[PDB]
Amino acid sequence: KFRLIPYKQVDKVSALSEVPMGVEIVEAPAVWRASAKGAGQIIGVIDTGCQVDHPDLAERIIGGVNLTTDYGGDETNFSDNNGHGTHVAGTVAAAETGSGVVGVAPKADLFIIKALSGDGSGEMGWIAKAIRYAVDWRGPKGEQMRIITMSLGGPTDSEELHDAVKYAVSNNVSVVCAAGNNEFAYPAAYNEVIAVGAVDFDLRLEIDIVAPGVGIKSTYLDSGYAELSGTAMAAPHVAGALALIINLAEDAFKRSLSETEIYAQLVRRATPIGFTAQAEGNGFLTLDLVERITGQFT
Amino acid sequence: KFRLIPYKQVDKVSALSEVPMGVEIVEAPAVWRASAKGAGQIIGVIDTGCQVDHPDLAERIIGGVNLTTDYGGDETNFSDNNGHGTHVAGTVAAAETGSGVVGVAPKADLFIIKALSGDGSGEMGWIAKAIRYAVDWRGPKGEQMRIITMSLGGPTDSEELHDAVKYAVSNNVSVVCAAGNNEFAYPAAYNEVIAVGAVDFDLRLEIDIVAPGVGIKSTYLDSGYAELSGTAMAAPHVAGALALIINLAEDAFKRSLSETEIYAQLVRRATPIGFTAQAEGNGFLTLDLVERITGQFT
Ligand code: NA
């Protein structure tokens, strides 16, 4: 089985009214205006489903599929019976609703892929499909996923899933996976994946980038919110960031950019914290970095 | 026909003593100790050949080949019959010899692929041969090139050229080429190519990065030196830089890096001047960037 990278439950609550600390510590709002808050980009969330009617998520969700044996399986039913999937969605794209929470890409859309059961586990074949499907899907107007995000891991170097990964990347999809806390090694170990480690809000602890992962408030079941801590919680911040990054980079270059170019655009928005490269990769996600260094010479 | 992106021959000097301003402004010397001055890396200079015995170059050249009909073409004779090739080579990697000049990677090795005639031009196929030649080449001890540099352009999108290029990129050779001033479009225009634009030392102006291109002093024929101005002159700074960057990045990450990751390693060493990305790409080559941003938050 491939499964949710373990994390801690901290809180469940019924009410929030805030921009999470991780959304702002990563400098998303500083770039919202120039990025149109991620409009025109879709993130394929590969996870346990989503609460499709959550007040924070409903106007941001556009489709989803269920690749699981849960609920039949009715492919049309990609409700969350775990909760983790809904939490991810929130960090990526919760809307400015005048309350609850707000995501890194508050104007991007979500395509929900349930490839995990309620128990947070999934057959690997489902993950391979999830990746392939997200690549091949186009919305009714021509729209497509440039971003995949998962916070799952598996002990196994499975050729079929490595293939899906190579397939996504050669078709221009950024593949974001949370670093296994080997047991959770794949698909994050794969050279072509963007692997994301975690730090806390004090910026304390094979990855490319680190983002916030301790005490991350997001949406949760029954139209509520939960606070979760762990590695799995850093990945959705980067998935969101890419929505923003793709928009601004392509607008600046006035040109389409490849998966390769897009990756370089992400990692140049990573400020090293002073930890080692194995600990932090290229550093912490600072979305305004380019603008801070523009003009700055010796 | 493909030819050298046109340049002004501003001057012919015959003796020097100095690190060139292009080499310092790019901040190569700040990164010299940690990159070990480029040792271990080999750059395939695809050009007009090189004065093999240049006092500044001889110790840096481990081999070459002549894929042209000049000199026979005796494939063993890669001597320069133009001057440009010797110039490139000096910027990429002239030696610290306490006179003449010194290159961006003064301890990197040079393989000299002469695929252009004394007249600055070459049959498209020669360039394709030359790309495929540098990728496949193995040393006496199993050395290979990770870096390809050229300053040429042709009007024609020929697939044999593009495939050659894709083939260096899937084998993790970085391919570096100058963005000419539609007649010099190829191969610079190719997505997988690192296209280098030019600025002057005042940082005044489909590209990736910009580097110095005006009044560039380097090695010339007859053991001398010359100063040239033009787009073609910025590329070598970048290919030099790569030798440097591969060593310091592979050292920090404790691991081989792919050509995609190396790419990212280059563009996060580019500071933007404050043009649009269209005009300047990712910014001006600044090797010391990561050091200076380490530790630096809102
Ligand atoms: Na010298």
Automatic annotation (TrEMBL), chains A, B:
Keywords, in A-Z order: Calcium, Hydrolase, Metal-binding, Protease, Serine protease
Residues that hold Ca(2+) according to the record: 183
Entries under PROSITE patterns matching the protein: SUBTILASE (PS51892), SUBTILASE_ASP (PS00136), SUBTILASE_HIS (PS00137), SUBTILASE_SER (PS00138)
Cysteine sulfenic acid (-SOH) sites (modified residues): 50, 177
Protein's name in the database: Intracellular subtilisin protease
Molecular function terms, GO-annotated: identical protein binding; metal ion binding; serine-type endopeptidase activity
Pfam families associated with the record: Peptidase_S8
SUPFAM superfamilies: Subtilisin-like
Residues at the active site: 47, 84, 232
GO biological process: proteolysis
Sequence similarity: Belongs to the peptidase S8 family.
Residues annotated as domain Peptidase S8/S53: 38-273
Top-level taxon of the source organism: Bacteria
